[PDB]
Symmetry: C3
Subunit: 203 residues, 3 copies
C-alpha cells in the first residue's frame, strides 16, 4: 500500500517528478527509497551531480522520503582546483603539461555529501562538497549549502546562514528516536496521519 519506490515516474501524467533510486546508474550515488527529484526540464537526477569522477571516489548519499527541488545541483569534490600554488590545471591540455599530475594528497578533498532522511531541499539549491545535512531539515530556495545543516533546522542563503529550528529541542529528540523512515512500511502506513500532522506523541 503506497507507491512503488522502484517506479521512476510514480505520478501519472507527470513526466518531471522522478523517484531517484531506480534511475541511479553511476555508482557512488546512494539515494534511499521514496526520495524524488522534481526536474525543471524533465532531465535525470544524475545530470545534477556535477564534477563526479570515479578516480576521486567521493560519494553522494541521500536518505528516504527526501524532496529535491528543481534545478538543485551537487558540486562533488572533483570541482576543486589544486591550491598549493597556481589553481590553473595545466595537465589537462597535455602537449608536455600532462606530466604535472596532482594526486589525491595534493587536492583539497572534503569527503562525501551526506543528506539524511525526510529532508526538504528547495529549488535551485546548490550543495557544496563534503557537506552533511541532517534529518528533517529544510533548505530554502536559491540556497548554497556551504556548512553542515543540523537535523530539523531551517536554513537558506549564500553563504548558508542559519534561520531557526523546526521544533523545540526536546521534540527533535523525539523524531530522532522515532526514525519513522526506517520503521517497517506496514508500520509507517499505520502511522502516516501522525507522521504527517506532527502529533508524534500518539505512538
Amino acid at each position: 500500500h503506497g507507491p512503488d519506490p522502484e517506479n521512476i515516474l510514480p505520478i501519472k501524467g507527470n513526466r518531471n517528478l522522478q523517484f531517484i533510486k531506480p534511475t541511479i546508474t553511476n555508482e557512488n550515488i546512494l539515494v534511499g527509497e521514496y526520495s524524488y527529484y522534481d526536474s525543471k526540464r524533465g532531465e535525470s537526477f544524475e545530470d545534477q551531480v556535477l564534477y563526479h569522477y570515479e578516480v576521486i571516489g567521493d560519494k553522494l548519499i541521500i536518505g528516504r522520503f527526501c524532496s529535491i527541488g528543481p534545478g538543485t545541483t551537487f558540486i562533488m569534490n572533483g570541482a576543486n582546483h589544486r591550491m598549493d600554488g597556481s589553481t590553473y590545471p595545466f595537465h589537462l591540455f597535455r602537449m608536455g603539461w600532462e606530466k604535472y599530475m596532482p594526486s589525491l594528497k595534493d587536492l583539497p578533498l572534503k569527503g562525501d555529501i551526506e543528506i539524511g532522511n525526510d529532508v526538504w531541499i528547495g529549488r535551485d539549491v546548490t550543495i557544496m562538497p563534503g557537506v552533511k545535512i541532517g534529518d528533517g531539515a529544510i533548505i530554502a530556495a536559491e540556497a548554497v549549502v556551504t556548512k553542515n545543516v543540523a537535523p530539523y533546522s531551517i536554513v537558506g542563503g549564500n553563504p548558508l546562514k542559519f534561520i531557526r529550528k523546526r521544533f523545540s529541542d526536546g521534540v527533535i529528540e523525539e523524531w530522532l528516536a522515532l526514525q519513522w523512515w526506517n520503521l517497517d512500511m506496514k508500520i509507517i502506513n499505520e502511522n502516516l496521519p501522525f507522521i504527517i500532522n506532527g502529533d508524534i506523541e500518539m505512538l
Copy 2:
C-alpha cells in the same frame, strides 16, 4: 502619444521584451500597464510564475511602469510543504496515500505578492511568497527577495539585505504623495522630462 500599453512586443525587431498585461491569460495575476518583461530566451512572463495553483488562490500583483529583468521568477505559495511534521507530500503519489490531504489551514500560507509601481527588478531575481515591494524600489540582480522592500529603497542579496534609500525621507514622501504613475496619460507626457530627471520640485510647481 507613447506606445500602446496593450501591444505585446512594443519594440520593433525585439522579440524578447514584452508588455506583460496583454499577455496575461491565466487568472490571479494583475500586472499594471506599461510594465514589461525582458525575456532571456523568449519565455513568457507567466512561465516565470511558479507553483501558482488556482486551488490556493493567492495572486501576483504588479503595478505600472515596472521593469522585470530576464530570468526573474515568482515563487507563489503552492511551493511550501506542510511543516507540522514530515514535509513529504505523501498524498501526491496516491495508491492509498491520497487521503492524507492537507487543508489550507494546515499549510504555511503567507498571502499575495504585491509589487508597486516604477519598480526596477533586476536580472535573475527570485521573489519569495507573500512579499510586498514598495513603489520606486530597486532590486539588485541575483537577489532573493525574502522580506518586504520599502518604497524607493535599493536592496539585494540572498537573503535580502538593505543597501540604501534612493532619496531623503522628505523626498520619498513627495514621490508617493505625487503618484505620477496614476495621473492621466495626457499629464504623464507633459511632465515626462521631470519624471525622468528626478525633479519632484518641478512637478510640485506644475501640480
Copy 3:
C-alpha cells in the same frame, strides 16, 4: 612545448572547454592567452557578456591562465537604468518617447571590469559592472562579485563577502613581485613544477 594558446578547443574530444582569446570577434573584449571557459551546453564565452553595448564603451579585461567556470556572466554597464527619477526606459518604446534619451553623464556608469591573472572564477558566478579582481584570487561558486577582490584572496556569496587570504601577506607580496604569468614561455615551462606546488623559496632561488 605546451598547448597552442590560439586553439579554440585545446582538449581532445572535449567540446565545452574553450580558450577564450581565439573565440573573440569584437573589440573592447581583452582576454589574455591560455585563459579558458568551461561551458555548460557549448555556448561561447561572448554569449556570457551581457548588456555590452559598443555605444557605452566599457571593456571586459581578463588576464592570463584564468579558469572561468560554467555559467559565469559579466553584467556590463549598459544594464543600469538611469536613477535620477523614474528608472523606466521610456525612450526604448519610441512613438514620441524616443526624444527622452539619456546621455552618458546621466547614467550610473562604473568603468571597466578588470580581472587579473591566474584567477579561479567558480561556477555560476555573476560579475557586476566596474569591478576589479586581483591576481590569483579565487571566487567561490554561485558568488555575486559586487566589490573589488584583492589579489590572492578567497571570496564568495551574495553580496560578495571576504573569506580569507590564500597565503600570508609576505608571500602574496612575492607572487605579485614575481609575476610568473608574464615571464617568457620558455621560462614558465622550466618552473612549472614550482608554479604548481608554490615552492616560492625555489622560484626566488631560480
